[PDB]
C-alpha cells in the first residue's frame, strides 16, 4: 500500500529537488563560507513536525525563532551558529508537507473545524511514512548518507 | 477519494513552487526580454504527458527537441520563438510527475517488466486528476488565470 501514498511522492520530490540540490551545492564550494566562517563539512538536520498543517512554513518560522537558528541562503536554509564549530549544523522543516492538508482541505465543504478520526490516523501514518522513505533515500546514496539526518520536532 | 491521491499534492506543489514562482518572476520584469526580444505578455503551456514514466524529464527532453522549442532560463523554461510575436509562448512538461512511477517502483521487487492492469488504471486516473487539480488552481487565481493553459501532449 506504500508507493501509492502522497507522503512517498513528497519525500522523493523533497529528496531529489531539495536535499540532493543543497548537498551538491555545498560540496561544490571551494570553501564553505557562511557569515564569514569557513567550515570543513556540514550536517543537514531535517525536522519532521510532530503535527501536520496546511501552513508548515508558518510552523517552521515559529520553530526556528523559538530555537534561535539564523537564516543561510545558497536557496535558503537555517544554521545554529552557536552549536556549529568546523561542522556547520543546518536545518529545514519540509514546507512541502503542508500539501497533505492542502489537498484534503481542497475537495471538501468550507465550514469544517478540526479533523475526523479517519483524518488524524491518516496524517499520523503519512508523517511516519515520509520520515521512513526520506531516511531510506538518504542512506542509499553516498552523496547524502553521511551529510543528512532526519529528527523529530 | 480526491485529496488523498498523490496527483493532488503533486499539482499543488507544482502550482505553488513552479507555476506561481514563474508568473510572478515574469510579471516582476520591467520588460520581458528573452534572446533580445521584448514581449508585452506570455502564455505558459503546461504539457500533460499522454503516458507516465519515472523519467518524465527524459520524455520532456525528447518532446521539446521533436517540437523545436529553445530553452529560456529565469529557473529554466522552453519558448517556441517561431510561433511567438508580442506574446511569448512558453512550455513545461512537469518532471514532478515522474515521482508517481518512482514511488510505485520503490517498495516493489526488482525484476518487474511492465505494469499490472491495476497499475495502468491508476496512472490514467492520476494523470487526469493532476490536470483537473492544476486547471482548478490556475483558474481560481487572478495571478495565473489568464497566463497559464494546460494541454495534452
Residue numbers in the entry:
A (entry chain A), B (entry chain A): 5 to 78, 87 to 165
From the paper:
To reveal the molecular mechanism underlying cAA recognition by ElSTING, we determined the 2.57 Å and 2.55 Å crystal structures of ligand-free and cAA-bound form of ElSTING, respectively, which forms canonical V-shaped dimer conformations. The ligand-binding pocket of CgSTING (~51 Å) is larger than that of ElSTING (~30 Å). CDN binding will induce the closure of the β-strand lids of CgSTING and ElSTING in nearly perpendicular directions. These structural differences result from the direction of rigid-body rotation upon ligand binding: with one protomer superimposed, the other ElSTING protomer rotated clockwise by ~26°, in contrast to the anti-clockwise rotation of CgSTING by ~21°. As a result, the ligand-binding pocket of ElSTING retains a nearly identical distance between the two stacking F169 residues; however, the distance between the two stacking residues in CgSTING is largely increased, facilitating the direct release of the ligand into the solvent upon inactivation.
